Amino acid sequence: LKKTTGLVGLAVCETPHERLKILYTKILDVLGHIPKNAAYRKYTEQITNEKLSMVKAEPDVKKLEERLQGGQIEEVILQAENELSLARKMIQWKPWEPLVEEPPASQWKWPI
Amino acid sequence: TLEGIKDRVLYVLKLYDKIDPEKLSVNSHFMKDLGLDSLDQVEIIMAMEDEFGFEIPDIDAEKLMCPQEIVDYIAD
Amino acid sequence: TSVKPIFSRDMNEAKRRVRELYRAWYREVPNTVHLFQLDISVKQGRDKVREMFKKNAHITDPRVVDLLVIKGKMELEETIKVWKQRTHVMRFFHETEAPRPKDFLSKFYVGHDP
Amino acid sequence: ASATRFIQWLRNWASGRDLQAKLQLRYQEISKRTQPPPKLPVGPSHKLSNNYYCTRDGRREAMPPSIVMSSQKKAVSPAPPIKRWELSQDEPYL
Amino acid sequence: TYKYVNLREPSMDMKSVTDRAAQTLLWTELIRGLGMTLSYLFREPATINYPFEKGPLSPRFRGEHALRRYPSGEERCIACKLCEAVCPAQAITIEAEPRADGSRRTTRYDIDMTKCIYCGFCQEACPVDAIVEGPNFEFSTETHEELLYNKEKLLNNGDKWEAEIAANIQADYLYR
Amino acid sequence: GEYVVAKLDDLINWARRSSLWPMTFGLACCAVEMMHMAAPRYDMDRFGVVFRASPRQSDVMIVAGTLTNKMAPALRKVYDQMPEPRYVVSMGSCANGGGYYHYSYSVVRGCDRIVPVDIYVPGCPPTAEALLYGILQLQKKIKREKRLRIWYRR
Amino acid sequence: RPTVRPRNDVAHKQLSAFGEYVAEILPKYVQQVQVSCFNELEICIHPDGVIPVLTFLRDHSNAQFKSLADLTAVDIPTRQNRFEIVYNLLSLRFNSRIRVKTYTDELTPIESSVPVYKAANWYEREIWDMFGVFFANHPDLRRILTDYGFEGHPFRKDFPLSGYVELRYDDEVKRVVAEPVELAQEFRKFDLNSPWEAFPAYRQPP
Numbered sequence A: 001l002k003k004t005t006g007l008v009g010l011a012v013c014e015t016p017h018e019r020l021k022i023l024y025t026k027i028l029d030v031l032g033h034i035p036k037n038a039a040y041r042k043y044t045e046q047i048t049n050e051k052l053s054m055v056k057a058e059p060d061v062k063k064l065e066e067r068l069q070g071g072q073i074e075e076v077i078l079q080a081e082n083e084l085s086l087a088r089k090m091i092q093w094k095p096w097e098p099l100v101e102e103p104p105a106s107q108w109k110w111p112i
Numbered sequence B: 001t002l003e004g005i006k007d008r009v010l011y012v013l014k015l016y017d018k019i020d021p022e023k024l025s026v027n028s029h030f031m032k033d034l035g036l037d038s039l040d041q042v043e044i045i046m047a048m049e050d051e052f053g054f055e056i057p058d059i060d061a062e063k064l065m066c067p068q069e070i071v072d073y074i075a076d
Numbered sequence C: 001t002s003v004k005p006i007f008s009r010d011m012n013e014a015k016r017r018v019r020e021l022y023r024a025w026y027r028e029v030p031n032t033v034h035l036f037q038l039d040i041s042v043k044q045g046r047d048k049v050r051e052m053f054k055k056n057a058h059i060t061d062p063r064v065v066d067l068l069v070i071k072g073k074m075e076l077e078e079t080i081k082v083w084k085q086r087t088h089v090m091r092f093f094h095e096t097e098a099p100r101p102k103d104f105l106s107k108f109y110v111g112h113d114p
Numbered sequence D: 001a002s003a004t005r006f007i008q009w010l011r012n013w014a015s016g017r018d019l020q021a022k023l024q025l026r027y028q029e030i031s032k033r034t035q036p037p038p039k040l041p042v043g044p045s046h047k048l049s050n051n052y053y054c055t056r057d058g059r060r061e062a063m064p065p066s067i068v069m070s071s072q073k074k075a076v077s078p079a080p081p082i083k084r085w086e087l088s089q090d091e092p093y094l
Numbered sequence E: 001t002y003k004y005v006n007l008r009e010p011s012m013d014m015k016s017v018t019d020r021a022a023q024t025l026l027w028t029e030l031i032r033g034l035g036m037t038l039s040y041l042f043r044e045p046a047t048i049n050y051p052f053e054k055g056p057l058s059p060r061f062r063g064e065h066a067l068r069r070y071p072s073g074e075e076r077c078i079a080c081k082l083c084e085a086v087c088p089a090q091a092i093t094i095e096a097e098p099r100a101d102g103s104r105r106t107t108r109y110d111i112d113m114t115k116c117i118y119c120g121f122c123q124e125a126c127p128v129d130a131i132v133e134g135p136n137f138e139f140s141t142e143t144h145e146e147l148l149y150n151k152e153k154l155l156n157n158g159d160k161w162e163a164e165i166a167a168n169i170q171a172d173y174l175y176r
Numbered sequence F: 001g002e003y004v005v006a007k008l009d010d011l012i013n014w015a016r017r018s019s020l021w022p023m024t025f026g027l028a029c030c031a032v033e034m035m036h037m038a039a040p041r042y043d044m045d046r047f048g049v050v051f052r053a054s055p056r057q058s059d060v061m062i063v064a065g066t067l068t069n070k071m072a073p074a075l076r077k078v079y080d081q082m083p084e085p086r087y088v089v090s091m092g093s094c095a096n097g098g099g100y101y102h103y104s105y106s107v108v109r110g111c112d113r114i115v116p117v118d119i120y121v122p123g124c125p126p127t128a129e130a131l132l133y134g135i136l137q138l139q140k141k142i143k144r145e146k147r148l149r150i151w152y153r154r
Numbered sequence G: 001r002p003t004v005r006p007r008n009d010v011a012h013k014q015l016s017a018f019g020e021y022v023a024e025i026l027p028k029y030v031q032q033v034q035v036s037c038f039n040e041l042e043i044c045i046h047p048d049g050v051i052p053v054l055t056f057l058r059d060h061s062n063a064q065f066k067s068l069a070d071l072t073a074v075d076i077p078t079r080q081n082r083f084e085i086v087y088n089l090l091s092l093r094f095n096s097r098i099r100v101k102t103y104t105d106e107l108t109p110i111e112s113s114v115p116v117y118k119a120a121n122w123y124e125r126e127i128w129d130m131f132g133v134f135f136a137n138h139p140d141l142r143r144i145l146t147d148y149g150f151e152g153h154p155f156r157k158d159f160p161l162s163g164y165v166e167l168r169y170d171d172e173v174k175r176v177v178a179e180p181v182e183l184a185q186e187f188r189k190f191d192l193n194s195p196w197e198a199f200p201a202y203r204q205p206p
Ligand SMILES: CCCCCCCCCCCCCCCCCC(=O)OC[C@H](COP(=O)(O)OCCN)OC(=O)CCCCCCCCCCCCCCCCC
Pocket: E024, E025, E026, E027, E030, E031
């Protein structure tokens, strides 16, 4: 057990494996309320499932951190919380729907 | 107090400069008759909130177009 | 002709915010004249407030009216909070500007401008 | 550099350092204020042949942006994840 | 690569704790600070005796402007207006006409020294070394107007400072 | 009569120029060269020019940097609170006449639109030595004053 | 070649792939995606997508753009929507930068991005001050750089360089006063553009 994450305000996590299993599982549940063909669901389930499989396949925290490449394991937990928060916001936003409106003809033309 | 409330309403209006006392009547319209502006009416109401010491919201204030209607509103 | 609104969805809604702003300005002038120790009368200050409102009386676009109210409230906040100094308040009155000529003959005598 | 030996000893002891080795005033160690003239080199485009500007024209090799999508499979990141920094071996801790 | 500025654990043995107690009660580190300022009291100060002594400058120094001549006395400036075009502050105003002998010369050459940012672009741009920033920096005035240089003032500066200006150009022109 | 008035003028002039306490308006980069004038190499204190004086104890205002429109009222207010005799030193192109920002919508084209200026120090920035030359020029201006001689002849 | 900036195809390919990735996930909002020849990725979006797109890029595990480097506007009068709003983001996780662009006119509010990045607070105030773009639901929208009571938005292309008013101290009223601007020397306009095309690669079709 490390004594500090080295980042001010980021407390050390006593049980990182259990915390990540809970978070990644929560994410796959929220993603189930998104349409099956939405790219956000397919892509997020893919990366979430890869991380969850890494967590189960590696009991040593320092070796798990190397596998995930997300910095400290406490950083990886925080990113999982961010993804879970994002997944819930996407359900209300529904960004997989068609483009709301095309721009005017020369909107993105440069130089004029 | 209906007389008491009404007498004060007229007292303020005469104090207001842009109204001729002789033209003034308890049934005159601020616009159609007295020939006042929208912002003139708003100033009058603000004087009403001062004499009677309570707040008159804009939704209600836009209906008070004659001295009599002010009496009716203050009754409540 | 279908646009995003700012605050008001029509002129009646916008005209309410104008009246609320006018009342706020009307009641603030007496404290402004005292706090800034201005030499103008309270009537002058209110006469100036009314003049500022009246030059915008011809607007019929609720979005434009909304921005005028938005800007008018910023100006009020600057005044009530004494972020403005005395110079900023008195800039509305153009005391050092001499009266420009308005009729054709006067403008003709002094220069070339229309 | 003009301090007496006693004063030199006194200020060295008070500061705890050998101040005379690293005086903050400059004496003769600074470069002369008159120097021999330079003879500066020339750049790589200073050639009499095989030097056409159209083969070394950086500005004209600029291109408009590549439009990858216009409103007219594995997940990816904008780049590989950053590598962990290594602790200094010169002096890991102050 | 990184290092920790402030990540150390105090030793909690009795000797170390008593060392920190002595520092707290006997103000040892504060006394150690008094030693530093005491040692500076007995150092020679860095002050120079201005205006009898001057800070060192180099030939590249950008000071007061001047208009230069050829050895014959003819003006170098031929009113090309490159200096006026490059001036980041628009501090230069030039007018020109054919001289009575047909030479291409200026009739106006003004530098607003209160617009000028003393950047040296004018003397880089000049193709004939006509306008230069000379070595003088001691030309403060009592009025704003005195800092609005016309051509007569700038030619007078060139005649006043040419001895030093030429020598400085001689020292640096091989870097240009 | 003449001799006493002249000698007394010399005395008060010498005291005032030998004890010039500046209020520095460090508006922008020119303020850095002012710090260098206080730094050991030039040591403005050795001339009797204390490093930083309070505005109500000040005899000279040094405007060291760009004066914006937003700042102009505050600068005038400080000048008016200064006790007399008071002098103003304008430092650098910005304060002298707007400088690089002369054509900006937000910049006063010279602090002499706001306060009377005694000395103009050119440069962008003037070197610390150039500013010191200017301060000494102000000292010489004070040495030329004849307040008591003019008072005697009223 | 000593004088030519080298290309970096690996970064160009990575950024292009991520640009398509973002466009696939938020088709509701993404209008255009492009990568420049010096490898900068730009996402052009409908203005309704400001909050969803910025939130996604901040929070998504394959983006993690946790830092808002800059937020600014550009005035282009020839466009119906003259103001281009530019967000420059930085991802420390993937050591990458992305640029998100949307548009608005003089009367259309843009949603404030303060909920996503607290850094946006003052940047949006600056945009309002300098360009007059109104941000909706800002905690405190007001001028930040200009003088109190200053009229107009100076960074608009049609606002004159020296402005409309200037200040001086007036002795009669004993205060600083504002008056119409008169310049002792008018700013001298220069016409510098060469009449010969410089860059064929950017020639516009006639
Ligand atoms: C056998 C029986 C014996 C019985 C008697 C035994 C008694 C003797 C043994 C005990 C020794 C007692 C020492 C008394 C000195 C006072 C000590 C003290 O108060 O220091 C503590 C004080 C605060 O310390 P701090 O680190 O900020 O935090 C501690 C609390 N949180 O820190 C400070 O006070 C710092 C002071 C700040 C001021 C700085 C400027 C002064 C520095 C120069 C001082 C020079 C010394 C003065 C000499 C005077 C000469 C006349």
